[PDB]
Amino acid sequence: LPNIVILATGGTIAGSAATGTQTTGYKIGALGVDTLINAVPEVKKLANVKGEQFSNMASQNMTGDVVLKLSQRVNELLARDDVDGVVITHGTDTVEESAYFLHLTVKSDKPVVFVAAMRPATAISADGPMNLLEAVRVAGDKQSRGRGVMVVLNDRIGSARYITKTNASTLDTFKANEEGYLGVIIGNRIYYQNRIDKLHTTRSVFDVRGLTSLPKVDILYGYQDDPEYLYDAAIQHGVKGIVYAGMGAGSVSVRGIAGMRKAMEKGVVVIRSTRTGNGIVPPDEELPGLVSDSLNPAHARILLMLALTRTSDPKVIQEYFHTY
Amino acid sequence: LPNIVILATGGTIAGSAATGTQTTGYKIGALGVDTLINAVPEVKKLANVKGEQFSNMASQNMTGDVVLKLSQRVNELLARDDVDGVVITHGTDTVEESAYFLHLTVKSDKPVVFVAAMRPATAISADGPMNLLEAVRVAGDKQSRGRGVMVVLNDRIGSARYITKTNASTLDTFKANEEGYLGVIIGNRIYYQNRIDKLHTTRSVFDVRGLTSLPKVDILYGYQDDPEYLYDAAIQHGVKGIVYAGMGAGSVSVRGIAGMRKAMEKGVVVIRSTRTGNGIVPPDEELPGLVSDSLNPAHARILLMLALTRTSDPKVIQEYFHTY
Amino acid sequence: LPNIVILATGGTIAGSAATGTQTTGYKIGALGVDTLINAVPEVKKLANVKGEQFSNMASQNMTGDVVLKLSQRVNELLARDDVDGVVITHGTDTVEESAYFLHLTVKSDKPVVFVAAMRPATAISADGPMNLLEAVRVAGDKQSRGRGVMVVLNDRIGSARYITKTNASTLDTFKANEEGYLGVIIGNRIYYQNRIDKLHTTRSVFDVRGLTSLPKVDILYGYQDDPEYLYDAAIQHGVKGIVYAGMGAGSVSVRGIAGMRKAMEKGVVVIRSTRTGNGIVPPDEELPGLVSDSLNPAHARILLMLALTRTSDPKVIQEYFHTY
Amino acid sequence: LPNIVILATGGTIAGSAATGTQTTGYKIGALGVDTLINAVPEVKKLANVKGEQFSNMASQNMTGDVVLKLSQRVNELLARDDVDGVVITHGTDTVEESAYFLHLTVKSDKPVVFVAAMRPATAISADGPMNLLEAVRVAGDKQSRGRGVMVVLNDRIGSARYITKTNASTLDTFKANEEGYLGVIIGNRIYYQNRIDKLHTTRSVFDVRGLTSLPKVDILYGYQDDPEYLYDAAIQHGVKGIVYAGMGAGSVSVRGIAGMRKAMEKGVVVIRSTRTGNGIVPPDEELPGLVSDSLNPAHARILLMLALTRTSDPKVIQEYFHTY
Numbered sequence A, B, C, D: 001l002p003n004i005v006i007l008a009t010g011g012t013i014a015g016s017a018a019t020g021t022q023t024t025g026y027k028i029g030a031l032g033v034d035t036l037i038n039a040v041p042e043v044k045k046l047a048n049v050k051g052e053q054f055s056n057m058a059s060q061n062m063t064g065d066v067v068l069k070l071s072q073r074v075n076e077l078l079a080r081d082d083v084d085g086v087v088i089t090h091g092t093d094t095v096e097e098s099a100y101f102l103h104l105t106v107k108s109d110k111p112v113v114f115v116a117a118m119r120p121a122t123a124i125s126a127d128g129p130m131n132l133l134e135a136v137r138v139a140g141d142k143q144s145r146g147r148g149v150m151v152v153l154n155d156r157i158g159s160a161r162y163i164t165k166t167n168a169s170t171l172d173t174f175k176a177n178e179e180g181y182l183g184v185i186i187g188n189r190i191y192y193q194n195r196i197d198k199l200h201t202t203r204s205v206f207d208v209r210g211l212t213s214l215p216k217v218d219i220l221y222g223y224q225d226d227p228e229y230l231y232d233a234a235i236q237h238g239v240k241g242i243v244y245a246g247m248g249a250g251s252v253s254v255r256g257i258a259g260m261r262k263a264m265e266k267g268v269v270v271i272r273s274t275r276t277g278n279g280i281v282p283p284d285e286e287l288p289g290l291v292s293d294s295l296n297p298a299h300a301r302i303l304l305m306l307a308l309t310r311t312s313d314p315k316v317i318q319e320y321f322h323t324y
C-alpha cells in the first residue's frame, strides 16, 4: 500500500456541532486529524496513512506566511522515500489560494491532494468522509503523479490552477467552468480526463524553500463608481502588487485608471483580472497594467506574489501569467 | 405594431473599429442609435421604433448619478400612452448594475429590456444586430409585461435580479447558473419559462424620482491576508455602506471582522456577499453585518444604495435582501 | 406541525449494501420506508410524518401503469384534510418521468415533492438522509403551495417540467441548465427563486383518475445511419406515438423521414425532440411530425401519452407541447 | 504562413436563405467552399488557404460510409508536405460523430479542425464567419499539433472525444460539461488549457484506410416501459453492436435485460451508455454488456463500430472504452 500523509489544516471538514442540522456556530479548532481518519477507517485499506496536525483554523484566516510554511513542509515530506503522496485537509473558502500556491512551489511529481467539505463532520450526509476517502485514493494512485496539485470534493478532481469555489454554499461548488475537471472518481475508480497544459510543480521556476516572507499584494474590486482612494490606500500601505477584479475583461473606469497610473509610478505591479468568474482578460496596450489571462483574482494574487519573489520584469511577469 | 423606444447609452454594441478582427482599441462614442437601428432594418417589421440617444459611453464609466437619470427617463417614457416598451443599449461590463437598478425603480409593467453585445458593431459575426432584434421582439410582446427588467443577449432573456456577466470575453457570458433564464428566443419566437419570485418594478418600494444623488457604497474583496486598512479608508471617505465580496459564504477573516465592526460603530451598514459567483450567503448573527441572500456584490451594492434612501433599520434592510 | 405522508417507491435512496463503499450490487427492495424515516429522526421536528410503502423497486423498472396508480394514490391523499403534503421517495433514473406525470395529473395545490439519492443508504456520505430532510421541509412549507410537482436533491428544488438527470453518477446530477431551479434549501431555509410559466396540477386538463389503460409510446434515437426498420417495428407493435430523440433541433435523416411518414400514414403521432439535452425544437412545416418545444425525450413521451388519452388532433397536441 | 486546406462537407455554415431572420427551410447544398472563404477574406492573413468541396449535405444525412471516405481524404491531405492542417466545415447535428471518427482514424499529428455554425451564412449575426476564422487560426498554429481532432465554434476549442451538441438551437451549444475545452480563442489569440488524457490519432490502433464499409451498430433508448421488441428488431436486422442510451448509469429494465441477453446470445456486442448527457457508466458484473465509461451514445456508437473492424473480444473492447 502507498504511504500517505494526511496533513490537516482545519476547515469545515474538521468542524463539529451539537446537532446534525446545525450549519452556523459549529466549531473549527477542536477536531483533530486522527478523528477524521477514524471516522473513515476504510482509508486504511487504500493506504498506510499517517496524520499530522499542521494547523486547525477556518480557512478565511489562512495567511500567506502560513501557506509558505505549508509549502515548505510538503516539500520536506515529499522528499522522503517513505512518503508517496500527501492529502491536505483544508477549509473550502480559500483552498483555491493555498492549492494554487503549492501547485507552483512543490518540487515533486508525487501527488498533493487538497480536500475539504461543505458540511461539518457532524452533519447529516456530511460530505467530508467520502471526500477524504476519494482524496486518499487519488494521492495513492501511481497514475496520479505529475498532474500538478489537485483539489478533490464531490467525486471530482480539479486542477489547482482552474478550480474555484463557485457557489457560497453547495456541495458541488468546486468547478472549472471552461476547463473542466482533471478527472472524476466514480465507483471506487479514478477516471483521468485531462492534463493541464500549464507549468507546475517540477517544471515550475518558483521556489520558496528558503524564504521567510512574501510580497504584499492586495485585490481591489471594479464596479460603477469605484473609488480612486482605495488605490491611494494600498500604495500608502506598501503593496508591491495590486490585482484588479475588473468589470468585464479587466475594464477600468476613469477613476481606476488614475489609481493604477499612481500605483505604477510608485513601482506597484498591477494585474487586471475580472470579477466575472471566468474567462480571458486579453492584452490591451492602451490600458494600464498587465493582464491575468484566465486567472481569477484570488489565483492571480498568488501568482503575482510568487512572481515578485524572483522578478520585477513586466515582460517576464506577463509571460508567467500566460504559462502558469 | 408596438411602439418601442430604443434608448442608447453606449457600449461595445455601439463600438467601431477599422477592421472586422479588431478586439481592442475600437472606439465607443461615435456610433449613434440610428446607425444601430439602420444596420437591422428588419426591426421596423417588429415594431415602430424611435431612437433616443441618452449617452454614448463605455459602461465601465457608468455612474450612479447617470443611472439615476436613466431610471427617471425610462419612467417618463413608460408613463406615455404612445410607448409600449423600452430597449436600452448598454455596455456589457456593468449592464447588470444598471439593469438591477431599473428593476427596483421603474414603476410600470411595460417591458424594459437591456441589450448589449460582446463584439463591436464592425466585427466579423457581430452579435449586436441579432441581440437588438431579439430585444425589440421581447419588448413588444404582450407576454413580456410584468416580468421585471430584462437583459437580452445570445437568444436568452435574463432577469435583472439573477443575470450576471460570468465570463470576461464570450458571447454566452450572461447566465444565471442557479436561476436560469426567464425565457429564450428561438426561430423568431419567444419561449417564456419562468417568472421570478421576487419583488420588483410596480411592487417595489424604491422610488428615486426627484432624487439627484445616491448614498455612497463601496465593495471590498475577501481573500487570504485581506487588510483592515481598506475598511479604514472607506470609513474615512464617508461611505454609508460596504458590500463585502466574501470568501465563501460571506466568511470574514479576523482583519475583516475588525474593519467591519469599526465601520458599524460609525453607522456604516455592512452587507456580506460572496466572491464565488453564485449562491446563498446564509444568516449568521454572530458575524458582523447583514447577508446578501443570493445577491452578488455588484447587485448587493445597488440594493444597498437604494435601501439607504429609505431606511437605516437593519431589520428592514435585511428583509429587502431576502425579498428583492 | 404539518402533516406529511412519505410515500415510498424504492430507489437507491432505499438501497443497501454490506459495506459503506459498495456502489454496485447493493440491493433495492428490502429497505422500508420506516427505516428511511428512523435514520433521520430530525424529520419529526419538521413535520408529523407517516410512512406508506407504495412499492420497493429500482426506478428503471417503473412503468406507466404503476405511475398511474401512484398518481391516483397521491390524489386520494391530498384530498384529505389531514394531509398537508406528500414526499415520494423514488429512484433517480426515472424520477423525472414519474414526477412530470404527476405534475400534469395531481389535482391539488398541496406540495408533492419527489426525493431520491445517488448513493445507497449504507454509503459513506450517503445523500439520501439530507435529501429526505430537505424534501419534508419543502413539502411542509406553506410557501411551497401551487408550484407544481418538485424534485429535491442536493439542496435544490427543481420543477418536474424542467429538471432532468444530467449525469450518470454524480450527486449534483439533477439540473435544468436553461431554466434553473425553482428554489434552493440552504442553512435549513428555503429560498424560492422562480415560478414555472407553464400549466400544471390544478390548471391542467389531464385527469387520469378514471383512466383504464395508457397509450403505447416509444422513443427512437437519431444518429448517423439511423435505421428505418425501428420505425417499422414500432408501427407493427401498435404504438400510438413515437418520440424522436433527434439530432440537433429534431433534425431527421432521409431514413427517419421515411419511417416517420410511414408511421403517420398509420395514425401514429410523431413528436420530434432532441438528443442534445436542452433547448427548443422549433416548428418546421417541411418536416414530419409535431415538435417538442423544450421537452426532452423522456418528458415528451409522458406528455404525449397523456395527450393521447384525450385527443388525436395534432393541432391540440402541438398546443399542449407549447403550454405544459 | 501555414498552408491550410478547407474541406467542405455542408452544414448550416453553408446554408442560405432569402432573408437574414429565416431559421427554417434555408437551403443547404448551394453554397460552395469558395463562398465561405470569400465571405472572410481576413483568413488569407492567417493562412494560405485552399478550398476543396468534399460534399454539400445537411449533417443529419452524414453516414459512416461517407465519414470513412472523409477520413481517407484527410489522411491523404495530411501526408503531403505542403499541407500543414485541415479545417472541415460540417453541420452541427452530427459533427461530434464525424469528428470522433476522425479522432480515432487520422494518422497524423497535424491539426484537423472541424467547424460549424448554428445560423445560416445569410443570417443576421451569422456565427460561421468568425467560427471559420478561428478554426483556421487553430489549424495553422504549430502549438495545435498532437492534440487530437478538434471542434471549433463560439471562441471554444473542444476535443472530439468530449465535445457534444448540448442544446438544440443556441450558438453556445457545444460544451463538455465535465471535461471543459482544450482551449479558447479570444482577441485573435489561442489559449490552450488542457491536453486530453486519451488515445487518439497517431497513438490510436485504428486504421481504416482501405475499408469501404463498417459494422452495423444501432442505438436504443432506455425509458419507462421500454420495449423488448426493439432489441429483437435490431438483432433480426443484423446489427453487430447495440449502444444503449440508458436510464441513469446504464440502468436496464427487466425488458432491456431480456433483449440484451438475446442479443448477446447471437454474438451482438452491447455497450451500456447513458441518456443523461454526461458522466461515467461504471462496470457492473451483474448486468449484461460492456460499459461506455464517459462516452455518450453517439460517440460510443462510433468507437464500437471501429472496434468491431478489428475485434469482437469483449475484454479488448471494454479497454478501448476506457482508453479512447
Ligand SMILES: N[C@@H](CC(=O)O)C(=O)O
Pocket (backbone or CB within 6 Å): A010, A011, A012, A013, A028, A057, A058, A059, A060, A090, A091, A092, A093, A094, A116, A117, A118, A119, B248, B251
Ligand atoms: N469557513 C470554512 C468553510 C468550509 O471549510 O466549508 C473554511 O473555509 O474553513
Ligand SMILES: N[C@@H](CC(=O)O)C(=O)O
Pocket (backbone or CB within 6 Å): A248, A251, B010, B011, B012, B013, B057, B058, B059, B060, B090, B091, B092, B093, B094, B116, B117, B118, B119
Ligand atoms: N467595455 C464595454 C464592453 C462591452 O460592452 O462588451 C462596455 O461595457 O461598454
Ligand SMILES: N[C@@H](CC(=O)O)C(=O)O
Pocket (backbone or CB within 6 Å): C010, C011, C012, C013, C028, C057, C058, C059, C060, C090, C091, C092, C093, C094, C116, C117, C118, C119, D248, D251
Ligand atoms: N437504479 C437506481 C438509481 C438511483 O436511484 O440512484 C434507481 O433509479 O432506482
Ligand SMILES: N[C@@H](CC(=O)O)C(=O)O
Pocket (backbone or CB within 6 Å): C248, C251, D010, D011, D012, D013, D028, D057, D058, D059, D060, D090, D091, D092, D093, D094, D116, D117, D118, D119
Ligand atoms: N441540420 C444542420 C444544422 C446545423 O449545421 O446547424 C446540419 O447539421 O447540417
